[PDB]
């Protein structure tokens, strides 16, 4: 029940720029999250999980932090292939949300 | 190098019933708690119920409960998920994803994940 | 001077799950010990603190048979020291146990086609029960950091689960009806000689 | 009270095979090309550390990631998922100029394993260690 909202979807970003992308909790949730990574036909990915531990197998760029509702996603570089959508979940309530989506893509 | 497979692209009319399947290949069946994810197409992802094998526990979303049940065969180690009267708008992509347990706490943050049933009503 | 009713615990009609063990008291009267020795259906019988062969030889207090239901691969931990499931959240033996520990099949009488839920047992619990206790209390159990305090959901695990046995199920697997006989070494009023 | 040799793995006679990598209770830093590390962030306990010391141009470089697959990769070091570890890859053309090396090309090795004009512009040798944490 805890409804989840990113920042605009639109994000236009070339090549090694930064990108952030800030989801903010509707209740308290702590410092729990999960950001994801949905590339095209295929399943998300996780990236950063408790919001300051970065998940094992994926580049240091992507990088999270925040505490209590404002959480943030900062992109260091936008290599090529981080072409995709993101999402956040919450770790709190059971009824798990994901955010409604950030794709960062061409025009 | 855990990976999760799932059945085919079930196709089956609204009303009826599916029994969509995730074979966690790889990993003891005491350290994941499967956690079924649903994508319908241009939408985007949607929980309806986790389960726990070694525990044998299940809790559902308030949205699915009883609409969606959700059954781990640990003899096999192939949870499955059951969409009792699949009808309305039901039609997406359902993954699988196993989220880490330690000692008996879930901790959430689905890391591997299933190809997904590509779950549609449609000649395509 | 009149015979025990054992046949009101051995031959009840059903038993109460584990995590509610019956404890019926059996006093002011004569056991015969042997017709429970000599019985071919016993699975299981061993004795911690007194020969089987002797029981209606010694004079005890009172009789206490905690009657309860578990699964085959539980009954090996109804059994003083041992540790694991049912000997940590639903039924720990006192290590000093002066009594009987009987067990039975029971697949044919409380284990319907299908899966019968009657039966529960406790997962989880706070820690470990001391020796002869009853958690019949259903609270929530607070796994993670989260004071949820109400409906269950994430970390936040019911303690009672139930068997689900089933007639197919393997025979390590199957519901074994147990009755542990408790006797403590003091006036003594269910003996004969 | 002491430090690893990372004054010796980074700088030492030569660099051995790719099939047998060269050879813990130390403190580690990062201020000691392709800065970019895995897993982890740049900037912490550890448990053992595992340096994998090759040599591979700077073409067949861009192989050496878990999302990016090839031959080079495949056949001769393919990083682990869920990897918790860096990379450093650093120029060697210059000190090691001079077709005679002792580095493996192998693209039929086995299988898939389950663990200037005159110079070339994909034939330029780069210097990899990958760092693996075992905590």
């Known amino acids: 029940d805890i409804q989840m909202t990113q920042s605009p979807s639109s994000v236009s970003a070339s090549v090694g720029d930064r990108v952030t992308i800030t989801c903010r909790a509707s209740q308290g949730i702590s410092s729990w999250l999960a950001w994801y990574q949905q590339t095209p036909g295929k399943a998300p990915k996780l990236l950063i999980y408790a919001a300051s531990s970065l998940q094992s197998g994926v580049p240091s760029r992507f990088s999270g932090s925040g505490s209590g509702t404002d959480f943030t996603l900062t992109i260091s570089s936008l290599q090529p292939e981080d072409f995709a959508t993101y999402y956040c979940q919450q770790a709190n309530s059971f009824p798990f949300t994901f955010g409604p989506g950030t794709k960062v893509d061409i025009k | ?124 | 001077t009149n015979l025990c009713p054992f046949g009101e615990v051995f031959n009840a009609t059903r038993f109460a799950s584990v995590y509610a063990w019956n404890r019926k008291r059996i006093s002011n009267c004569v056991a015969d010990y042997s017709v429970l020795y000599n019985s071919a259906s016993f699975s299981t019988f061993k004795c911690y603190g007194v020969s089987p062969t002797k029981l209606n030889d010694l004079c005890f207090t009172n009789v206490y048979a905690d009657s309860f239901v578990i699964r085959g691969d539980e009954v090996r931990q109804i059994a003083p020291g041992q540790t694991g499931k049912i000997a940590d959240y639903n039924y720990k033996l006192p290590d000093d146990f002066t009594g009987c520990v009987i067990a039975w099949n029971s697949n044919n009488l409380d284990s319907k086609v299908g899966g019968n839920y009657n039966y529960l047992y406790r997962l989880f619990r706070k820690s470990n029960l001391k020796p002869f206790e009853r958690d019949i209390s259903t609270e929530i159990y607070q796994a993670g950091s989260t004071p949820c305090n109400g409906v269950e959901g994430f970390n936040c695990y019911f303690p009672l689960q139930s068997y689900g046995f089933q007639p197919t199920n393997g025979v390590g697997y199957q519901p074994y009806r147990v009755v542990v006989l408790s006797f403590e070494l003091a006036p003594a009023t269910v003996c004969g000689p």
Do not use: H
Request: net charge neutral.
């Open chain 2, 1 to 124: 190098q855990v990976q999760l497979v799932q059945s085919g692209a079930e196709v089956k009319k609204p009303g009826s019933s599916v029994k969509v399947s995730c074979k966690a290949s790889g990993g003891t069946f005491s350290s994941y708690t499967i956690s079924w994810v649903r994508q319908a197409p241009g939408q985007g992802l949607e929980w309806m119920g986790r389960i726990i094998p070694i525990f044998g526990i299940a809790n559902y979303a308030q949205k699915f409960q009883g609409r969606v049940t959700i059954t781990a065969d640990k003899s096999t180690s192939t949870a499955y998920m059951e969409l009792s009267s699949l009808r309305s708008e039901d039609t997406a992509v359902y993954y699988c994803a196993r989220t880490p347990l330690e000692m008996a706490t879930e901790e959430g943050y689905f890391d591997y994940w299933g190809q997904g049933t590509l779950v549609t009503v449609s000649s395509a």
